[PDB]
Design a protein around this ligand. Structure first.
Ligand SMILES: CCN(CC)C(=O)[C@@H]1C=C2c3cccc4[nH]cc(c34)C[C@H]2N(C)C1
Lengths: 274, 338, 225, 53, 229
């Protein structure tokens, strides 16, 4: 049965995202400015695996027909949009911050404090809210007086100008920065024209970029294709936007493990279960 | 003639050793064998005083058991009201390198010193509502390690040029100099009667001086390395000293020899500060292992561990009425335990 | 809570605000500890009981401390958080070179300096070149291994010099580098440099070394290593 | 050269010092410790009403 | 330590005025300030209070809504602005300094004052008592409610006003003796009953004695006891 096989994707997400928070909170040698921006990312992924993912399993197990009370459909949508956008913009701000700390390292260590973390967190979450809020305004309506299931999905005819410019502000603008920053940072670390410590970092800056550019590109490319192609078959394109979204969802169980365990202190904290 | 003098010195040292050995008939361990142990003590933190932005080097309790003073590497001297955790006074220091601080028994003066080889005395109670530098005593060659007020006009200091001095604050010049040590002097401890004091230095020895006469009376050598902290029994006939050999020792004055040693196989780090309780039954020591230990003075067994600091423990003090213990460390936080 | 207690609390809050402002203002400078045995010209390294020195480069401020008799272990515990330790040694003479090597051993393997980097200056290079060209004294008298020492074939010498000067200076630098890499692993690195009596530029090298050290710290703390 | 005379004189001054047995000093120390046991708040916890902290 | 007050004269009712208090001789920024007033033939009445840093301002109910406080620290000046003056505002105004920490002595210095013309009750039963040199004198002050706090501090203050002179502090917190005061002045008592004792009375001790409370705002004074030869 698929249920027992798929809760082995929900359990690790919660486990890892709680372990990261416990490790940062208790241990006092991991409490600095850049590690305060990582809990903001870790909480956005824990909420994905606790409120977004089980509902998806419920909508798969029964009939693909909404079993929940009929007033929660327009709320889950912007929850998904907001949490995903927050994760993406977190992963972009981390890259830009890493670039700054390498090109101008003295000034990057003199303008770091708790106020900057608050400013960054606020800006990221304001952007995420500003991208997701047009979903419950233009809410989903029902034609049947007694709605057995509203078929809680965004549609092309209704949500057509949002699937185009909502993807250019949630994925395609962050991707442009993450391309000019990976290729201008590996240039600055290659100033040395066993393995050096600027060679272990230049490999940990590729495992994360490749993982990011493997779990979200399918979804957004298929979305833009569905919007801008009027001749493609729409039935097969919908069977494709049902396994690609889960690939994006499982990214939340990967983030707390590739941004955290490359440091020995975090591995030690994870040992003995914090 | 040098060989004859050296031989005479060796013979006299042997005579002193034999005289000390002749006075040892029973040990303190046997006489205190049939004594009820203090059991296990447990102290919890009550107040956490924060505001320092660097390592804390020393602290001193007030005579009213409520106010204290703290010194840190950031260059500030802060007076704390323990009960309400309010800051009464903050004094900026000319030199950021400070190693000791003191509080006047009258409560209207404070003292500071460090690597500038100058002892600065500040006046607390004055008109126009500010703290001003009252005196700057100079004349030492090395850094100052400790300073203790004798009265409102006399102070005692120990420096890193293997010497101690007694200063008259009004005149500003030394009146007595004590020069017996061969290594850096690290700690000094006064006496309740304000007539004698002990000094511990880096030559693995301690000396008992006379304030009026100015001559050394007794010397004690029982350590394998330099000793960092020295205390004084409330009775006035004994003292305790801790070294970086992970060992504390209790020394007598009338018997002129060691009494008891405190050490364990699990401790290998040094000892930074020591202090005594009101009745003398408890000996509190600070270690480099980020922990503080409580020893039974009459039985040499641990009875409690204070563990609340995440850096090196620097300074330890016990209230006059014996109601609280203040510990300051290298994590910019100092705490009160009860 | 009485009115006087409220006023005392307000005074405490103002004191806290001033302390925080002072601490924030005092965090923008770098601190260096300059020390040398003797006869090394450490007082003239930067042209621009505690001696203090200011110098600023590229809008970055450096404060250098020179303390000035045998056992320095007691007062060296204070300098456990400085940016770097600048060790200056005169390579012109060879009678007291072993004392400098022993001093570098003692400083490098200090308990309280396990995470502090050392910038090494090898001063008085002109005197060394003049002495080695004169041919009066010989290194083999003091160091036997100089007779059988591999030439710096792989390395590139500076443009214009006698090979003997290059061999001598490379031997001295190797002697210091080997003792540096003997312990400390990658926790702290040493940066050797060659300086003369009158060098126009010396703060730029310290600036570059500090930039590299801070880069390594940033790589360590950004969860990259 | 002349420091040996001072050292031997100081050792002579230290040598002729009246000393008592260890047992008497230990007994006096423990008698003092036991006589002030009831006035030690750290040795025996005080009631919360009388605790200023 | 000097405080000089400026501003005054005959003012028609309904006018506006601005009184100034300039300080010279102490750290003005570390002291809170008070404005007090005295009627031509009556006692002392509290008027207004400004704190250090201008974070707390208190006014009296009689002058609420038409009196304004200000302070300038770089210029070391205190300003009191008066609008809609009436016939009950004719008095002499005093500028007082006070500092608050553990062990401080507020109300330690008083200014000379300037003239202007247009809840807890403290009772002093006696009005005038004849005295002779070298004789002990005891004066009593009563309070409506207890002035003792849970922290152990009893908030009572004593002041002396000589003929043609500003009042000065004598005893603060009912037990402590101020600086520059002879030891022959003593104070004692309990809740709602306090006594000031003078032993070996001599000259320059004649005047009016005032007892003041500092438990809660507004601050209230007593009627005053007069000592005459
Ligand atoms: C399989 C069906 N679901 C869930 C109901 C989606 O397609 C969600 C729709 C999203 C979506 C649409 C259009 C624009 C956008 N920006 C950001 C997102 C977004 C998030 C994105 N979530 C992750 C999936």
């Amino acid at each position: 049965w698929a249920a027992l096989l798929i809760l082995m994707v929900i359990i690790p997400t919660i486990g890892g995202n709680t372990l990261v928070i416990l490790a940062v909170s208790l241990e006092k040698k991991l409490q600095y400015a850049t590690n305060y921006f990582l809990m903001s990312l870790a909480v956005a992924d824990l909420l994905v695996g606790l409120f977004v993912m089980p509902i998806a399993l419920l909508t798969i197990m029964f009939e693909a027909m909404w079993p929940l009370p009929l007033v929660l459909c327009p709320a889950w949508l912007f929850l998904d949009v907001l949490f995903s956008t927050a994760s993406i913009w977190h992963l972009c701000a981390i890259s830009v911050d890493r670039y700054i700390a390498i090109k101008k390292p003295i000034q990057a260590n003199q303008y770091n404090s708790r106020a900057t973390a608050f400013i960054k967190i606020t800006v990221v979450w304001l952007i995420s809210i500003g991208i997701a809020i047009p979903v419950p305004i233009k809410g989903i309506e029902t034609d049947v007086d007694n709605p057995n299931n509203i078929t809680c999905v965004l549609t092309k005819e209704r949500f057509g100008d949002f699937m185009l410019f909502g993807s250019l502000a949630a994925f395609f603008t962050p991707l442009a920065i993450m391309i000019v920053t990976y290729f201008l940072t590996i240039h600055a670390l290659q100033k040395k024209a066993t393995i050096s410590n600027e060679q272990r970092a230049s490999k940990v800056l590729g495992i994360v970029f490749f993982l990011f550019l493997l779990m979200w590109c399918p979804f957004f490319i298929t979305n833009i294709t569905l919007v801008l192609c009027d001749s493609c078959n729409q039935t097969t394109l919908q069977m494709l936007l049902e396994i690609f979204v889960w690939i994006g969802y499982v990214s939340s169980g990967v983030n707390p493990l590739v941004y955290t365990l490359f440091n020995k202190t975090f591995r030690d904290a994870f040992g003995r279960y914090i | 003639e040098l060989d004859q003098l050296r031989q005479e010195a060796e013979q006299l040292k042997n005579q002193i050793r034999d005289a000390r050995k002749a006075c040892a008939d029973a040990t303190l361990s046997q006489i205190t064998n049939n004594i009820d142990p203090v059991g296990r003590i447990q102290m919890r933190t009550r107040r956490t005083l924060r505001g320092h932005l660097a390592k804390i080097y020393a602290m001193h309790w007030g005579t009213d058991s409520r106010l204290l003073v703290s010194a840190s590497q950031d260059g500030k001297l802060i007076i704390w009201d323990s009960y309400t955790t309010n800051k009464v006074h903050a004094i900026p220091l000319r030199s950021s390198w400070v190693m000791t601080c003191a509080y006047a028994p009258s409560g209207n003066y404070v003292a500071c010193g460090g690597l500038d080889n100058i002892c600065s005395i500040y006046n607390l109670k004055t008109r126009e509502g500010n703290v001003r530098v009252s005196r700057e005593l100079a004349g030492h060659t090395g850094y100052l390690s400790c300073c203790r007020f004798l009265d409102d006009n006399q102070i005692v200091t120990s420096s890193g040029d293997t010497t101690c001095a007694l200063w008259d604050i009004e005149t500003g010049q030394q009146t007595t100099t004590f020069t017996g040590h061969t290594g850096d002097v690290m700690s000094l401890s006064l006496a309740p009667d304000t007539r004698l004091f002990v000094s511990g230095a880096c030559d693995a020895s301690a000396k008992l001086w006379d304030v009026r006469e100015g001559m050394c009376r007794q010397t004690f050598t029982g350590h394998e390395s330099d000793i960092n902290a020295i205390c004084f029994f409330p009775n006035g006939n004994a003292f305790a000293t801790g070294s970086d050999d992970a060992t504390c020792r209790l020394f007598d004055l009338r018997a002129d020899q060691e009494l008891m040693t405190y050490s364990h196989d699990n401790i290998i780090c040094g000892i930074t500060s020591v202090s005594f309780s009101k009745s003398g039954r408890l000996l509190l020591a600070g270690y480099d292992d980020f922990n503080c230990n409580v020893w039974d003075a009459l039985k040499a067994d641990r009875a409690g561990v204070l563990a609340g600091h995440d850096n090196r423990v620097s300074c330890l003090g016990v209230t006059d009425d014996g109601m609280a213990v203040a510990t300051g460390s290298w994590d910019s936080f100092l705490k009160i335990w009860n | 809570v009485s009115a006087e207690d409220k006023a005392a609390a307000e005074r405490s809050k103002m004191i806290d605000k001033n302390l925080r402002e002072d601490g924030e203002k005092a965090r923008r400078t770098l601190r260096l500890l300059l020390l040398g045995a003797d006869n090394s010209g450490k007082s003239t390294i930067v042209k621009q009981g505690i001696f203090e020195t200011k110098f600023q480069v590229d809008k970055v401020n450096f404060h250098m401390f020179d303390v000035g008799r045998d056992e320095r272990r007691k007062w060296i515990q204070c300098f456990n958080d400085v940016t770097a330790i600048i060790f200056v040694v005169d390579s012109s003479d060879y009678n007291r070179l072993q004392e400098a090597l022993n001093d570098f051993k003692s400083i490098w393997n200090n308990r309280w300096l396990r995470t502090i980097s050392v910038i090494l200056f090898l001063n008085k290079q002109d005197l060394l070149a003049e002495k080695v060209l004169a041919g009066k004294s010989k290194i083999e008298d003091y160091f036997p291994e100089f007779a059988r020492y591999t030439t710096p074939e792989d390395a590139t010498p500076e443009p214009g010099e006698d090979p003997r000067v290059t061999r001598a200076k490379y031997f001295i630098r190797k002697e210091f580098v080997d003792i540096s890499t003997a312990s400390g692993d990658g926790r702290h690195i040493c940066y050797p440099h060659f300086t003369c009596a009158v060098d126009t530029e010396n703060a730029r090298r310290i600036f570059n070394d500090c930039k590299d050290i801070i880069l390594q710290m940033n790589l360590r703390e950004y969860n990259l290593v | 050269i002349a420091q040996a005379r001072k050292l031997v004189e100081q050792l002579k001054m230290e040598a002729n010092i009246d000393r008592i047995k260890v047992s008497k000093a230990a007994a006096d120390l423990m008698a003092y410790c036991e006589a002030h046991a009831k006035e030690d708040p750290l040795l025996t916890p005080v009631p919360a009403s009388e605790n200023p902290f | 330590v000097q405080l000089v007050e400026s501003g005054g004269g005959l003012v028609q009712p309904g006018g506006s005025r601005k009184l100034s208090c300039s300080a010279s001789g102490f750290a003005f920024s570390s002291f809170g300030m008070h404005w007090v007033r005295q009627a031509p033939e009556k006692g002392l009445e509290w008027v207004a209070y400004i704190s250090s840093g201008s974070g707390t301002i208190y006014y009296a109910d009689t002058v609420k809504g038409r009196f304004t406080i200000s302070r300038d620290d770089p210029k070391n000046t205190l300003f009191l602005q008066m609008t809609s003056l009436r016939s009950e505002d004719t008095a002499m105004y005093y500028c007082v300094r006070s500092i608050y920490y553990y062990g401080s002595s507020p109300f330690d210095f008083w200014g000379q004052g300037t003239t202007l013309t247009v809840d807890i009750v403290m009772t002093q039963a006696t009005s005038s008592v004849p005295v002779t040199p070298g004789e002990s004198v005891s004066i009593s002050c009563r309070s409506s409610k207890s002035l003792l706090h849970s922290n152990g501090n009893t908030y009572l203050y004593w002041f002396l006003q000589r003929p043609g002179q500003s009042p000065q502090l004598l005893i603060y917190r009912m037990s402590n003796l101020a600086s520059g005061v002879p030891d022959r002045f003593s104070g004692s008592g309990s809740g709602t009953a306090f006594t000031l004792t003078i032993s070996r009375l001599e000259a320059e001790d004649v005047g009016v004695y005032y007892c003041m409370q500092h438990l809660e705002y507004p601050l209230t004074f007593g009627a005053g006891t007069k000592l005459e030869l």
